[PDB]
Amino acid sequence: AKQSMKAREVKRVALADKYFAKRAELKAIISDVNASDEDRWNAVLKLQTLPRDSSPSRQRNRCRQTGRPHGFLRKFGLSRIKVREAAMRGEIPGLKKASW
């Protein structure tokens, strides 16, 4: 359900590439432990203001083929409902029902 979160995610991967690539460990290099006596100063602590949407921490995905409100499953690119649906029709390979 609901296209706006699916719309957000599709824009995001080109915006990951554009903002975040040049500014991945830059947080760490300029501020944190990699800034060992170098940087840590104001004249360099203005450089990362473009990436905020681009960040992997907002790259939630959900169901990669329709969208779904939570309950995503990363190994299929699918969800609870949509896995069962694809299995009924035999579209998924290697698929047992558990018995041992």
Add this chain to the structure above:
Amino acid sequence: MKKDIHPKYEEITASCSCGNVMKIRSTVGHDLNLDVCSKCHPFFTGKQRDVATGGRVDRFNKRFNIPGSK
């Protein structure tokens, strides 16, 4: 002085000149408007904008976190 109870003379009759400003005193802050509290800031009683002591390491310049091979 009273007939049934007199003043004493044991320690309370000695040193008729002292002060805080006539003479030295080891304590200040006896006005109502000069008094301490020992406030230390909350969540910065020690340090929290901290220099690392659980993630300090030698300097590099890459882009990722233990990527290794890929």
